[PDB]
């Protein structure tokens, strides 16, 4: 009589358990991926695969921007990531690939000097190594993008007109095997 319920119940426990498990498993795999991509010398190379598909999701307005994994200035320095708009943003919407720099809340922010005042260099690599698209900027000590993070990420700041779209929607050497590579180099002077 009850024995039948005596099973449907546990079997309901197991599924609940096996279920609550996979979530943790999820967070663990994400942690591992983040660790796999991080660097601690202020130099970062971001490989964006499935460029065509992500390029379309950008035009079709489905997915306007993508964040990159996080990296650091030193083993215990600032935490940072990149944000890109495959089809542009602001003064670059529809015409240029827009690339921004993001300051994230780091584990050691209490030991670092604020505001963030380092020169940042951004590049779109020529997979032919002939002519890389490059641009750099110095932080505007007065912007809120470089103040000590109160949230997980400050307002991004960088180059809205980083690179012209036509420069890749045609026959180029920046897109190959349906993937592009972005490079970031944070000048470490003073650290």
């Amino acid at each position: 009589q009850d024995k039948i319920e005596a099973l449907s119940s546990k079997v309901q426990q197991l599924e609940r358990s096996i279920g609550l498990k996979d979530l943790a498993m999820a967070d663990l795999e994400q942690k591992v991926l983040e660790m796999e991509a991080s660097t601690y010398d202020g130099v970062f190379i971001w490989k964006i695969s499935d460029f065509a598909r992500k390029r379309q999701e950008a035009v079709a307005g489905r997915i306007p921007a993508i964040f990159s994994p996080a990296f650091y200035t030193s083993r215990y320095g600032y935490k940072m990531c990149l944000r890109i708009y495959l089809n542009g943003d602001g003064t670059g919407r529809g015409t240029h690939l827009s690339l921004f720099f993001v300051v994230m809340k780091g584990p050691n922010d209490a030991l670092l000097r604020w505001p963030f005042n380092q020169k940042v260099t951004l590049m779109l690599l020529d997979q032919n190594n002939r002519e890389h698209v490059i641009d750099a900027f110095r932080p505007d000590v007065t912007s809120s993008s470089f103040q000590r993070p109160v949230n997980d990420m400050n307002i991004a700041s960088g180059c809205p007109l980083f690179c012209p779209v036509s420069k890749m929607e045609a026959k180029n050497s920046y897109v190959r095997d349906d993937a592009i590579f972005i490079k970031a180099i944070v000048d470490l002077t003073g650290l």
């Binding site: 602001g90 940042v120 900027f137 307002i155 700041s157």
Partner: peptide
């Protein structure tokens, strides 16, 4: 140069 926030 100088940086510009995203809009």
């Amino acid at each position: 140069p100088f940086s510009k926030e995203e809009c």
